[PDB]
């Protein structure tokens, strides 16, 4: 039932509605309270850390435990971050290199 | 310790860095791939469902228990979202009542 095409369609519509809602929140300077409402504290903390992981993966200068050192992320978390960056369209990846480095 | 002054300060700045990175992604129409990179599929699904919860709570036409029957979220999740809505600043609440309802 969660795995039906109907639920897949509903999930994507709901995601796109959120995406569109946050787009307009940025336009109206309400993005910060909106992200406080819609995300828990540990999710905000995780998003801030994930930015630093992507930056350091793209810079390519640190190993496992130093990334585990200054960020406290396990080897599994960094691997999944690495997987996700490998899948990213390179328009996104090249822009991230420009702004994060 | 995660519960120190320096770690709190860094947690705040890392979160605001993500918020600004995403603001720039919207401006460049890279928000969808950035959000596919930075969030897991289940976090994206949760955010879609949380928009629906906030909508129905503000609407006030759906009982908190029949919210679970429609959306799948446990009463504990409905309650936490209601807690976050009660803590939201009024200007956000007023804006959501325009755009969600
Ligand atoms: O340290 C704090 O002020 C509380 C807190 C917990 N998780 C957070 C994520 C982002 C910003 C603040 C917090
Ligand atoms: O957070 C996870 O466990 C997976 C993950 C998704 N995007 C990431 C970006 C950087 C590091 C980890 C992840
Ligand atoms: O509350 C504060 O700002 C003081 C403080 C909390 N944890 C600390 C760890 C090391 C040095 C100072 C603090
Ligand atoms: O998802 C959670 O458990 C917490 C939560 C944060 N914002 C929410 C909005 C609606 C429903 C739940 C939440």
From Swiss-Prot, chains A, B:
Disulfide bonds: none annotated. Its main location: cytoplasm. Coiled coil: none annotated. Keywords: Cytoplasm, DNA-binding, Repressor, Transcription, Transcription regulation. GO terms for biological process: negative regulation of DNA-templated transcription; regulation of DNA-templated transcription. It is found in: Cytoplasm. The gene is trpR. This is Trp operon repressor. Homodimer.
């Amino acid at each position: 039932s969660p795995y039906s095409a109907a639920m897949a369609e509903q999930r994507h519509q709901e995601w796109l509605r959120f995406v569109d809602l946050l787009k307009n929140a940025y336009q109206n300077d309400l993005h910060l309270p909106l992200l406080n409402l819609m995300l828990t504290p540990d999710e905000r903390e995780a998003l801030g850390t994930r930015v630093r992981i992507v930056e350091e993966l793209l810079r390519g200068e640190m190993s496992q435990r130093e990334l585990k050192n200054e960020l406290g992320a396990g080897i599994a978390t960094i691997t999944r971050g690495s997987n996700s960056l490998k899948a990213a369209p390179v328009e996104l990846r090249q822009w991230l290199e420009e702004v994060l480095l």
